[PDB]
Short mmCIF file of C-alpha atoms in Angstrom, two decimals:
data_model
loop_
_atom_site.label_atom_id
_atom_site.label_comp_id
_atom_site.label_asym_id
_atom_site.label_seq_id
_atom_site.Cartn_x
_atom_site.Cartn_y
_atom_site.Cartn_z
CA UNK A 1 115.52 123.09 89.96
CA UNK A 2 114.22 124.29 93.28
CA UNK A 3 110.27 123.67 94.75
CA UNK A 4 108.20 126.11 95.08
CA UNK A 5 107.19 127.47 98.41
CA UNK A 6 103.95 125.51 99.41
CA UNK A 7 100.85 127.01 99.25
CA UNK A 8 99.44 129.59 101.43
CA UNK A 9 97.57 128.58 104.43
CA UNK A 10 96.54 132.11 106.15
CA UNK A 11 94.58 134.86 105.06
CA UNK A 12 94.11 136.66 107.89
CA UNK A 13 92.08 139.38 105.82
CA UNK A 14 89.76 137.26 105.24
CA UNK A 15 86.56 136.50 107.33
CA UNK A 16 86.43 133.36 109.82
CA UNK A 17 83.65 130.97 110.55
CA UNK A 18 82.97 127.97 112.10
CA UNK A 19 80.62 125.63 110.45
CA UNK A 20 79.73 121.75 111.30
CA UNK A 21 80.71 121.41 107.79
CA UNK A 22 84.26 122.68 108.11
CA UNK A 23 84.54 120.98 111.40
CA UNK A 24 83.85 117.88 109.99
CA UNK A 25 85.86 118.25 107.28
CA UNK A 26 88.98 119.03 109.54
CA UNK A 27 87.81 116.36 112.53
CA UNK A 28 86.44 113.73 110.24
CA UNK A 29 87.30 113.61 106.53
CA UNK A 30 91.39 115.09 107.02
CA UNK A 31 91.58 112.67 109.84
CA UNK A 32 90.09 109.47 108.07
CA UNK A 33 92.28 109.95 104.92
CA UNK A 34 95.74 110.90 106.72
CA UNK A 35 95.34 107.44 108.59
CA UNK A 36 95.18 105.62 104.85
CA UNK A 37 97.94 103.95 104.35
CA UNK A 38 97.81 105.28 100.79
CA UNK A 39 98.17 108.45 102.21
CA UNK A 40 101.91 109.44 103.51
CA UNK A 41 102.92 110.33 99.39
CA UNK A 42 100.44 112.86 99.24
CA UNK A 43 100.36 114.47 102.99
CA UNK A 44 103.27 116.95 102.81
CA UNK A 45 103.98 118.75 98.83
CA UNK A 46 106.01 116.77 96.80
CA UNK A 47 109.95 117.09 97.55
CA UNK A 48 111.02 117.14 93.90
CA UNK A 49 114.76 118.26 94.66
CA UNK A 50 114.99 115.31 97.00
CA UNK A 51 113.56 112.67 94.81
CA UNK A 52 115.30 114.10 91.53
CA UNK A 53 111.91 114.93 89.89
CA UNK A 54 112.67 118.18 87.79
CA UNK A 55 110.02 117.62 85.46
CA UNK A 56 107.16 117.42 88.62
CA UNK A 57 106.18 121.67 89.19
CA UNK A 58 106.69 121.87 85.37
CA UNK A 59 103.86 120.11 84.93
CA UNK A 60 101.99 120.74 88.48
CA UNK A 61 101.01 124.16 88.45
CA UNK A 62 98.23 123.93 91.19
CA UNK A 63 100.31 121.75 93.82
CA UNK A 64 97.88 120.31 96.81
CA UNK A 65 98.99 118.39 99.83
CA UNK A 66 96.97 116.70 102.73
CA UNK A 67 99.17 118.95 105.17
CA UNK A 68 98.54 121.96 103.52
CA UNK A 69 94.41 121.03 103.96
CA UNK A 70 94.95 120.41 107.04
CA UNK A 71 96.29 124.22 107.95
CA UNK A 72 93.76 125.48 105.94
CA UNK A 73 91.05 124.33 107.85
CA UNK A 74 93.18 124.94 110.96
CA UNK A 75 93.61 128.31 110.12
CA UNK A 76 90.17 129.30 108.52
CA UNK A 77 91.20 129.74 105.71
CA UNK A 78 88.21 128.82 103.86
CA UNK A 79 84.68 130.32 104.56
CA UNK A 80 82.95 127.53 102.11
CA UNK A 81 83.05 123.61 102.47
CA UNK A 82 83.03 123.66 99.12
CA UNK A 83 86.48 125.41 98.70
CA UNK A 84 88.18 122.88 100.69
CA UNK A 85 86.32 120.27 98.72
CA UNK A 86 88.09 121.68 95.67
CA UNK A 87 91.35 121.58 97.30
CA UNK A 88 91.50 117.84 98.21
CA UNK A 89 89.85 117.68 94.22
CA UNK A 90 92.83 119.23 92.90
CA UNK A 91 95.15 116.91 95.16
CA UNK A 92 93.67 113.94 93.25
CA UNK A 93 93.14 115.02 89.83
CA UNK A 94 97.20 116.36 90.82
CA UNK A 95 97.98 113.01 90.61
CA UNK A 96 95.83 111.58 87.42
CA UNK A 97 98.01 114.43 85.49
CA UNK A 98 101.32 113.95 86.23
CA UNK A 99 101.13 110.02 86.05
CA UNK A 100 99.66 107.92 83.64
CA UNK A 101 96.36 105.46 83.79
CA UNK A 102 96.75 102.65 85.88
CA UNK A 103 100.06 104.06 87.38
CA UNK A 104 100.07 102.38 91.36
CA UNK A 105 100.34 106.01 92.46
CA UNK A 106 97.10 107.03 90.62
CA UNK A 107 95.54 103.56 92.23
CA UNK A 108 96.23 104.42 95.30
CA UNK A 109 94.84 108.35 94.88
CA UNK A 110 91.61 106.82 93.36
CA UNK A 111 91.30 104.47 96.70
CA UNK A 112 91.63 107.91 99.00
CA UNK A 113 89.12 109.48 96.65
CA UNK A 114 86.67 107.05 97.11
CA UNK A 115 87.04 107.15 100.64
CA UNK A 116 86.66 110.82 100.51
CA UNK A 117 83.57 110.52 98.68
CA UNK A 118 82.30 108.30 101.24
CA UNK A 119 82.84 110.45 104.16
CA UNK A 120 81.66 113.74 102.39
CA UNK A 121 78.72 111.78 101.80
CA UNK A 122 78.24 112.36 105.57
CA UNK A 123 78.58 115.26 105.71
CA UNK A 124 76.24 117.51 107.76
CA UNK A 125 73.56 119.83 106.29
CA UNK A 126 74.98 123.79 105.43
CA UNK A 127 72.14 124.62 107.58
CA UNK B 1 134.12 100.83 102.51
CA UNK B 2 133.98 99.09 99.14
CA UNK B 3 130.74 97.35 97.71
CA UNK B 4 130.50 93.45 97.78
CA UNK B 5 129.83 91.08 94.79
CA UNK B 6 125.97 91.18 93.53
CA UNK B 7 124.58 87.96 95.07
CA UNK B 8 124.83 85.16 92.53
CA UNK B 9 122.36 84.83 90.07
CA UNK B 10 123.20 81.63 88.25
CA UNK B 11 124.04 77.87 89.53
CA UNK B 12 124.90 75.14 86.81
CA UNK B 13 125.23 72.90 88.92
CA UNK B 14 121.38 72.85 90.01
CA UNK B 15 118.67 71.48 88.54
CA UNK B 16 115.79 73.34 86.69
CA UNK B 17 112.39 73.51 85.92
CA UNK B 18 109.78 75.40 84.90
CA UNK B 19 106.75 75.73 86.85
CA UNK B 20 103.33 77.84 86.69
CA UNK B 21 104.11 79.32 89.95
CA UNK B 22 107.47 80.59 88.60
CA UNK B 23 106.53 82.06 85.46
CA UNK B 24 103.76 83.88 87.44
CA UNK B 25 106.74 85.58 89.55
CA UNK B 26 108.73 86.86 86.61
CA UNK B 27 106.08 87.57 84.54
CA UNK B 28 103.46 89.18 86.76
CA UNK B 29 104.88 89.47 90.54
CA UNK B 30 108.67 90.86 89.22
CA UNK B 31 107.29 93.12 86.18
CA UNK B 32 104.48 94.66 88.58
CA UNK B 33 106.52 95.71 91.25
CA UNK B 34 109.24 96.83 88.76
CA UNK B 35 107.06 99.05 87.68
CA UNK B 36 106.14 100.43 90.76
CA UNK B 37 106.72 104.37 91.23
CA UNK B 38 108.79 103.51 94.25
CA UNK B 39 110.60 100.81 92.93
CA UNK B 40 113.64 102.66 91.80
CA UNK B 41 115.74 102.31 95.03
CA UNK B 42 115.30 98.53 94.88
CA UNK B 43 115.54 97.79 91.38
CA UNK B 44 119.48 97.15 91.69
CA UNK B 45 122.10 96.38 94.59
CA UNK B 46 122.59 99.63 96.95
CA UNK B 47 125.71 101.42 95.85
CA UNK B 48 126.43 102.13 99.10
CA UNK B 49 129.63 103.54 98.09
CA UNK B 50 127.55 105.85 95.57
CA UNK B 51 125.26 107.14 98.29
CA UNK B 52 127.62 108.13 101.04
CA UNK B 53 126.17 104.68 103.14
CA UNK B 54 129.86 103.25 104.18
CA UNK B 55 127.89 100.93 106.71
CA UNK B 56 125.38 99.44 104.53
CA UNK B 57 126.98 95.72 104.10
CA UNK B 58 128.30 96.12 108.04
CA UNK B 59 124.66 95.89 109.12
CA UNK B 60 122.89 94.31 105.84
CA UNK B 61 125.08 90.72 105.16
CA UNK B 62 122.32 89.09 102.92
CA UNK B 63 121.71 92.01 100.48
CA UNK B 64 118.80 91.29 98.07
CA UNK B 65 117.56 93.47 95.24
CA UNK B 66 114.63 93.14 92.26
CA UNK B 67 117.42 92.83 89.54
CA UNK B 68 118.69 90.45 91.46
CA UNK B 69 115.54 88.61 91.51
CA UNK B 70 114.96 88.56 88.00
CA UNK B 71 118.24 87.38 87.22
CA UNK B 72 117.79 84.17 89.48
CA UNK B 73 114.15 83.67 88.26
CA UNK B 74 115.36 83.93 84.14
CA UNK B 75 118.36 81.99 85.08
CA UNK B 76 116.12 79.43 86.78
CA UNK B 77 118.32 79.43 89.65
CA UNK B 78 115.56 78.69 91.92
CA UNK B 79 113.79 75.23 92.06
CA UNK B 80 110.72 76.26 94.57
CA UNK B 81 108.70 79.18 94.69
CA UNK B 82 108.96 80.12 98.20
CA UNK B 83 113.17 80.27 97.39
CA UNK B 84 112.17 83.43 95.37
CA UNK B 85 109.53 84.83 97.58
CA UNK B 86 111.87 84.27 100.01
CA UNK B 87 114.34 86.75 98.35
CA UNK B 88 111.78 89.33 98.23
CA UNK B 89 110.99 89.05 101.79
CA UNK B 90 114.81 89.53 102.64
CA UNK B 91 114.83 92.95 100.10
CA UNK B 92 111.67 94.28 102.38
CA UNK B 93 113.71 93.13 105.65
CA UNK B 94 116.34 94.89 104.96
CA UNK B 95 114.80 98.09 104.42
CA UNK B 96 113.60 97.81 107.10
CA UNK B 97 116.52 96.93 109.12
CA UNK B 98 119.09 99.59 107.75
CA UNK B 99 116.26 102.67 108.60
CA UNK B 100 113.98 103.80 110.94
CA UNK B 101 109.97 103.39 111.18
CA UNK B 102 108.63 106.60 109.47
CA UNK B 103 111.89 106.85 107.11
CA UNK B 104 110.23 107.91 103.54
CA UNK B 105 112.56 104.66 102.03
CA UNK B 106 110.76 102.31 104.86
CA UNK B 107 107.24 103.51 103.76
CA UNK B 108 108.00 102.93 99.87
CA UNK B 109 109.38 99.22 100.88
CA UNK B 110 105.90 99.03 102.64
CA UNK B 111 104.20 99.57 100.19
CA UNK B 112 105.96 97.56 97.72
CA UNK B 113 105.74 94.41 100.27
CA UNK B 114 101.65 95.07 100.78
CA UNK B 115 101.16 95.02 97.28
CA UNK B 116 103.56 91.94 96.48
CA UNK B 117 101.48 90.54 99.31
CA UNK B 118 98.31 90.85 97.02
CA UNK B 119 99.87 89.29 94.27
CA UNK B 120 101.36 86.36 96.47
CA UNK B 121 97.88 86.06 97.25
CA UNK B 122 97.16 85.12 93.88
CA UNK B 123 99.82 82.63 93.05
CA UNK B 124 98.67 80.02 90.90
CA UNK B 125 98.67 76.78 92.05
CA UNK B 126 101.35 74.16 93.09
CA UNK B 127 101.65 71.15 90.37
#
C-alpha cells in the first residue's frame, strides 16, 4: 500500500549521444503531447496512495509516465530513438491493461497515441 | 461545520413531462459521465465534514452533484432541458470555484465538462 519509486532516469554509465532523432523526440514529440489536454493523467506516475488505487502497481508492473520521458531524454538516458519509442509504447498499452475497452481513460490514451504516431511520422532520418 | 440538506430532488407540486431531450440526459448524458473514471468525487454531495473541508458550503451556497442530477431528472423535477444542464454547469462551477487552476480535482471537472460538452452537442431535438 505504498508506490513504488518511479523509474530511473540516469545512467550515467552509460554512453551519451545526441541525435536529431532524440532531439526531436524531446523538442517535438514530448512537447506536442504534454500540451494535450488528454495528457495531465498520464504526465507524472500514477499516485495510487492518493487516489486509493491499491489494486493499480499490482497489476502495472512496467509503470511509464510522460515526466519520466521527459528526464530520460533530458538526461541521455537512451542511446536509441527506438528505446524511447518503447517507453511512451508501454505508457499507452499501460493504460489499455489496467482499464477496460472503451474506458474514457483508454479514449483519451488512444487520442495521444495517434498524435504520437503522427509526429513520429516526422521524424528525421537515423542518418 | 455541519453538512447542509442534499438539494431537493422532487417537487409535487410541478408539472411533468417527458421529453426526447430529457430522456437523452438520463439515459445517455447522466450514465456517460457517471461512468467516467473521474467521476467519483462528483457522483454524490461533498461530505465536507468527511474530508476535513469545514469551509466548503461557506464559499459553495448552490451545491450541485451527479446523484443529485439523476434524482431530479427520474423524479421529473425539471420541466426544460436547459434546467438540468443548468445543474451540471453549476457542479463544474463549483469545482472550479472552491480550488485552484492546476488543482488535480479542477482538471478531472474539466474534463468531465469538455466531454458533457460533446454530448450537449448532440442533444436531440426540441419538440
Amino acid at each position: 500500500s505504498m508506490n513504488p519509486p518511479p523509474p530511473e532516469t540516469s545512467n550515467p554509465n552509460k554512453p551519451k549521444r545526441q541525435t536529431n532523432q532524440l532531439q526531436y523526440l524531446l523538442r517535438v514529440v514530448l512537447k506536442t503531447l504534454w500540451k494535450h489536454q488528454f495528457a495531465w493523467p498520464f504526465q507524472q506516475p500514477v499516485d495510487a496512495v492518493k487516489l486509493n488505487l491499491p489494486d493499480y502497481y499490482k497489476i502495472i508492473k512496467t509503470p511509464m509516465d510522460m515526466g519520466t520521458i521527459k528526464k530520460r531524454l533530458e538526461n541521455n538516458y537512451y542511446w536509441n530513438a527506438q528505446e524511447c519509442i518503447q517507453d511512451f509504447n508501454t505508457m499507452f498499452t499501460n493504460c489499455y491493461i489496467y482499464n477496460k475497452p472503451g474506458d474514457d481513460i483508454v479514449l483519451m490514451a488512444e487520442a495521444l497515441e495517434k498524435l504520437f504516431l503522427q509526429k513520429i511520422n516526422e521524424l528525421p532520418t537515423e542518418e
